[PDB]
Amino acid sequence: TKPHVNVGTIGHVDHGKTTLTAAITTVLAKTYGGAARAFDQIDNAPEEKARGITINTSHVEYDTPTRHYAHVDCPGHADYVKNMITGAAQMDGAILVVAATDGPMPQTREHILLGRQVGVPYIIVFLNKCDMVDDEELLELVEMEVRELLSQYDFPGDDTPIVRGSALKALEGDAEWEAKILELAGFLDSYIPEPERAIDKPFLLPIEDVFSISGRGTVVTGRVERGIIKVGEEVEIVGIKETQKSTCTGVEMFRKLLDEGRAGENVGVLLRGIKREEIERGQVLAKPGTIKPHTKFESEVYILSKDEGGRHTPFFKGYRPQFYFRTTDVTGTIELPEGVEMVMPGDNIKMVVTLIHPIAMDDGLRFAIREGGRTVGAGVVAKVLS
């Protein structure tokens, strides 16, 4: 029906993320239609399991006249860390809530830093609790601090929309403050571009199985994550070993012979001139010249706590685990940040990884850290190096 956009509230503790989320749903429901959500319903977030990783997240939905929004709000800072690193709640844009009574605080910086690291494309600021501060000069000083903090982490602070509002007064029904919620939702519509749909990105298929079919020939199976593969087009096989070119001579779903495979479909792709022995676990099919294989990358990782089923023992610089990319494990070595010699369960750090086999990757690729086939961490590629 309507374009779908994924957003969420970030910001320091008690600056009003949950109150803002309730205010958005309530004001939009009475203005444009929809269902309002109360503060208690959003604050009492359910527990979800992405892949051994426990995250507490509330998911609300609301509509502007032209868009439908999926909005995440979390009760704990650790929940935001896990969500942004695992991508369990992906964000086309984030609402940074900064309380005017405090200005930017340590978690304001940390959430902006995580945003840049995991690739949050756009940030909108809601300067909250303005019902408490009447000083115009003080509000201007805080906005300048927020803009410089955003620019410090490469966001466009000078062009960042900043709305001076009161989430509480808007939730309580003050029309003068509800108008600021509508101004915020207006920036959601106008500042966050419509996200690029997967079918319009370069073709990519992670290979999950391989078969020799009748009359020689090789078929690889998997879900088309991005783009379209058409019969006759050339493909590259990227990862694990030297990149090979091949031609797609067929696509099929079950018993149906298709002339193309589209994003989201589970297909089998027939490859010409490729034998079964030339396909390795962890490889992908890709449009030629759109993704490259790499061994070394900078990442942000979360280490599972003991209570989450992770490891009980801390690890040190010689830690040599497996990195699960899409379909398979690849062993790698790590470099810890300067001044960090021990990493506890439950910690999150920047980590430079060197794999023993290249993996087709770019910034934003998610991965799991595993020991003996059991997930002990999750990461995101922040910057490829090799």
Ligand X SMILES: Nc1nc2c(ncn2[C@@H]2O[C@H](COP(=O)(O)OP(=O)(O)NP(=O)(O)O)[C@@H](O)[C@H]2O)c(=O)[nH]1
- Site residues (vs ligand X, CB under 6 A): 13-19, 75, 128-129, 131-132, 166-168
Nearest distance, CB of residue 5 and ligand X, angstroms: 21
Say whether 289 counts as a known binding-site residue: no
Q: Which residue out of 17, 82, 287, 357 is catalytically annotated?
A: 17
Nearest distance, CB of residue 180 and ligand X, angstroms: 10
Q: Is-catalytic flag, 14?
A: yes
Q: Based on the shown chain and the rule CB under 5 A, indicate whether residue 180 belongs to the binding site for Mg ion.
A: no
Tell me whether residue 81 or residue 353 sits nearer to ligand X (CB atom). 81
> Do 354 and 333 touch, CB atoms closer than 8 A?
yes
Say whether 154 counts as a known binding-site residue: no
Nearest distance, CB of residue 54 and ligand X, angstroms: 17
Say whether 158 counts as a known binding-site residue: no
Tell me whether residue 11 or residue 293 sits nearer to ligand X (CB atom). 11
Tell me whether residue 167 or residue 330 sits nearer to ligand X (CB atom). 167
> Do 374 and 306 touch, CB atoms closer than 8 A?
no
Tell me whether residue 13 or residue 199 sits nearer to ligand X (CB atom). 13
Choose the one of ligand X, Mg ion, none that binds residue 363, judging by a C-beta under 5 to 8 angstroms depending on kind.
none
Q: Based on the shown chain and the rule CB under 5 A, indicate whether residue 128 belongs to the binding site for Mg ion.
A: no
Tell me whether residue 79 or residue 178 sits nearer to Mg ion (CB atom). 79
Q: Which residue out of 4, 14, 241, 327 is catalytically annotated?
A: 14
Nearest distance, CB of residue 30 and ligand X, angstroms: 18
Q: Is-catalytic flag, 77?
A: yes
HEC string of the chain?
CCCEEEEEEECCCCCCHHHHHHHHHHHHHHHHCCCCCCHHHHHCCCEEECCCCEEECEEEEEECCCCEEEEEECCCHHHHHHHHHHCCCCCCCEEEEEECCCCCCHHHHHHHHHHHHHCCCCEEEEEECCCCCCCHHHHHHHHHHHHHHHHHCCCCHHHCCEEECCHHHHHCCCHHHHHHHHHHHHHHHHHCCCCCCHHHCCCEEECCEEEECCCCCEEEEEECCECEEECCCEEEEEECEEEEEEEEEEEEECCEEECEEECCCEEEEEECCCCHHHCCCCCEEECCCCCEEEEEEEEEEEECCCCCCCCCCCECCCCCCEEEECCEEEEEEEECCCCCCCECCCCEEEEEEEEEEEEEECCCCEEEEEECCEEEEEEEEEEECC
Choose the one of Mg ion, ligand X, none that binds residue 129, judging by a C-beta under 5 to 8 angstroms depending on kind.
ligand X
Choose the one of ligand X, Mg ion, none that binds residue 13, judging by a C-beta under 5 to 8 angstroms depending on kind.
ligand X
Residues 6+ apart with CB under 8 A from 338: none
Choose the one of ligand X, Mg ion, none that binds residue 294, judging by a C-beta under 5 to 8 angstroms depending on kind.
none
Say whether 8 counts as a known binding-site residue: no
Considering only the stretches 14-22, 177-185, 331-339, 378-386, report the one whose residues sit in contact with Mg ion under the rule CB under 5 A. Answer: 14-22
Say whether 18 counts as a known binding-site residue: yes
Angle (nearest 5°) at CA 24 between 19 and 27? 115
Q: Which residue out of 77, 201, 292, 350 is catalytically annotated?
A: 77
Say whether 248 counts as a known binding-site residue: no
Using CA atoms, how far apart are residues 21 and 45, in angstroms rounded to an integer? 12
Q: Which residue in 12, 17, 111, 366 binds Mg ion (CB under 5 A)?
A: 17
Tell me whether residue 15 or residue 326 sits nearer to ligand X (CB atom). 15
Nearest distance, CB of residue 95 and ligand X, angstroms: 11
Q: Which residue out of 9, 18, 64, 108 is catalytically annotated?
A: 18
Nearest distance, CB of residue 359 and ligand X, angstroms: 36
Q: Based on the shown chain and the rule CB under 5 A, indicate whether residue 18 belongs to the binding site for Mg ion.
A: yes
Using CA atoms, how far apart are residues 301 and 65, in angstroms rounded to an integer? 38
Nearest distance, CB of residue 164 and Mg ion, angstroms: 20
Q: At what angle do helices 106-118 and 136-152 cross, to 10 degrees?
A: 40
The contact set with Mg ion (CB under 5 A) reads: 17-18
Instruction: Give the catalytic positions in this structure.
Output: 14, 17-18, 77
Annotated binding-site positions for Mg(2+): 18
Annotated binding-site positions for GTP: 11-18, 73-77, 128-131
Annotated binding-site positions: 11-18, 73-77, 128-131
